[PDB]
Write a protein that binds this DNA or RNA. Structure first.
Length: 400
RNA sequence: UGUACUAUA
């Protein structure tokens, strides 16, 4: 810190005015210092005369180099966001040029700022607060190659894409949907903890739920097509995504969401069916299997049940049949508990059995009877384990 | 008895 601003202790003075700082030419030094930053933080929140604003505009967002320097700074990025806020609230003759310049600084260094832990905050702030038409120019400056993937998988940068999805109209970011939907890109992005969050947010924004009822017909159609292209790519890699440590959450979301019912049935039919036994024994996919049992339409649910109950094991090395393998498996046991709870819920009225005016009560009673007979014959083995005890308990609880 | 994310003074 400049010596003039210090006292006898080598400590920042008291009674310091914002104008002193602005006039000194030493603003950059206060802005990257913890204590200076906090003085500025409070100073910039108060009443500001026109020249105080003018000096902030010039020194904080007026020159590219000092702009970039503050934006990438642990303390300075906050001052930048404040001054941007004040600039957008100040409708004098300089409003347009200030905003245009800001748009040019960020655009020219888009990738670098997005990837930076601190500058990515300036970007998010700018996307939210600039006039939409200029925020759209920032989106347009996003890279379209491997750098876009790196943004998506970065713990900080991914939040830039999320901000875009939240505050920018689909038309302007439609290229992101198709970028992501490219098979190799989807592969990389969904195999990553942060990338998955990006895909998830995109899916939600593209969903025709209560948050999108304000769209025009034409805009609904644009959203509908984008979703359909993304889901095609997602469902093409469905087994890989469902068994993946991160992307299983995305598959679960699609399966669990009634507003994505058509895509849920696609996933169940083309990916889960005929693979229930093996998927049930996987750490990650077992969770997708539970969601599928819970949310499948009754016609598919009956096929899933049949697949388990009539599951022929060519060479039984881990148990005589699918039910037997799953009940005593470390992950599969959860799938069976799920099947059981569903049946008990059906038979006891806690779940609808009548889908679309037609009543599958008799099928639930049949499945429950099979499970009851199996648990009865196996009670001695099952009672050795917590999962077995829970099933025995679920059944005992039903008798009442 | 079995998984993620929720990121700066």
């Amino acid at each position: 810190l400049p010596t003039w601003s210090l006292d006898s202790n080598g400590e920042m003075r008291s009674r310091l005015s914002l104008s002193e700082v602005l006039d000194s030419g030493d603003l950059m030094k206060f802005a990257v210092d913890k204590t200076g930053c906090q003085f500025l933080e409070k100073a910039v929140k108060g009443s500001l005369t026109s020249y105080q604003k003018f000096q902030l505009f010039e020194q904080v967002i007026g020159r590219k180099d000092d702009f970039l320097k503050l934006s990438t700074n642990i303390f300075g990025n906050y001052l930048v966001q404040s001054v941007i806020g004040i600039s957008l609230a100040t409708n004098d003759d300089g409003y347009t040029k200030r905003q245009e310049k800001l748009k040019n600084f960020i655009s020219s260094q888009m990738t670098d700022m997005c990837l930076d832990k601190f500058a990515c905050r300036v970007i998010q702030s700018s996307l939210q607060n600039m006039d939409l038409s200029l925020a759209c120019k920032l989106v347009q400056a996003l890279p379209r190659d491997a750098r876009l993937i790196a943004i998506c998988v970065d713990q900080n940068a991914n939040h830039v894409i999320q901000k875009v999805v939240a505050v920018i109209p689909l038309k302007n970011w439609e290229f992101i949907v198709d970028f992501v939907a490219t098979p190799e890109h989807l592969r990389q992005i969904c195999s990553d903890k942060y990338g998955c969050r990006v895909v998830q947010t995109i899916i939600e924004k593209l969903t025709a739920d209560s948050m999108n009822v304000d769209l025009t017909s034409a805009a609904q159609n644009l959203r509908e097509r984008a979703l359909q292209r993304l889901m095609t790519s997602v469902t093409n890699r469905c087994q890989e995504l469902a068994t993946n440590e991160y992307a299983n959450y995305i598959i679960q979301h699609i399966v669990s969401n009634d507003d994505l019912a058509v895509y849920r049935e696609c996933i169940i039919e083309k990916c889960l069916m005929r693979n229930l036994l093996s998927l049930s024994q996987e750490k990650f996919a077992s969770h997708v299997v539970e969601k599928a049992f819970l949310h499948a339409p009754l016609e598919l649910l009956a096929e899933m049940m049949d697949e388990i109950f009539d599951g022929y094991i060519p060479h039984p090395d881990t148990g005589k049949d699918a039910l037997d393998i799953m009940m005593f498996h470390q992950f599969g046991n959860y799938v069976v508990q799920c099947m059981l709870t569903i049946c008990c819920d059906a038979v006891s009225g806690r779940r609808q059995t009548k889908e679309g005016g037609y009543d599958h009560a008799i099928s639930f009673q049949d499945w429950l009877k099979k499970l009851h007979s199996r648990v009865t014959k196996e009670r001695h083995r099952l009672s050795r384990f917590s999962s077995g005890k829970k099933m025995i308990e679920t059944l005992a609880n039903l008798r009442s």
